[PDB]
């Protein structure tokens, strides 16, 4: 019962649900299958101040179920609390389907920059120069030059 902690209207459980969503982050990623709205409507609730953290554990369930764009769109909506989490062997799958979705998106933008272009999310490109910051620091460049053709930027 970690899914039904996102029910109540009182605000004092809202900062106790973030006390009780991070503790249960380890194993039971298969049980949030039936809690899409209970993340998303409670993502739209202002009481649960760390609304983006609900999208962190929502990014944990849909890899375990294999809805790879649903983990991707919820890694987009997980904000700074996903931007702070990038040193993992979990996260190297869902920062990276992003780049797969990113490198084909701006191919379509390099085709037609004249009108009806798809809206750049600026979190879509917010990690790409941030991944280039790793290329600015970790001294590997034969992979770094290769995004810069494939990014169409």
């Amino acid at each position: 019962g970690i899914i039904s902690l996102l029910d109540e209207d009182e605000p004092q459980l809202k900062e106790f649900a973030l006390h009780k969503l991070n503790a249960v982050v380890n194993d039971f990623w298969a049980e949030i299958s039936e809690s899409v709205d209970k993340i998303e409507v409670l993502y739209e609730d202002e009481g649960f101040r760390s609304r983006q953290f609900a999208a962190l554990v929502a990014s944990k369930v849909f890899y375990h179920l294999g809805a790879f764009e649903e983990s991707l769109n919820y890694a987009l909506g997980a904000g700074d609390l996903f931007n702070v989490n990038d040193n993992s062997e979990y996260v190297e799958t869902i920062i990276a389907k992003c780049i797969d979705h990113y490198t084909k998106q701006c191919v379509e933008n390099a085709d037609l920059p004249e009108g009806e272009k798809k809206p750049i999310d600026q979190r879509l490109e917010g990690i790409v120069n941030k991944m280039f910051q790793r290329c600015l620091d970790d001294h590997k460049y034969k992979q770094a030059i290769g995004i810069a053709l494939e990014t169409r930027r």
Binding site: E92, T93, A96, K97, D100, M131, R134
Partner: protein, 40 residues
Amino acid sequence: GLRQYYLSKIEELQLIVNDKSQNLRRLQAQRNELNAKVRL
């Protein structure tokens, strides 16, 4: 992290190579038998 993803995609793109060439290996030999039938 980034390039970590890319060696997934080189190795399953290669899975199309080993059987469609195997289809072509089957297919190209069929023409050579049929062209040997014609010229003879």
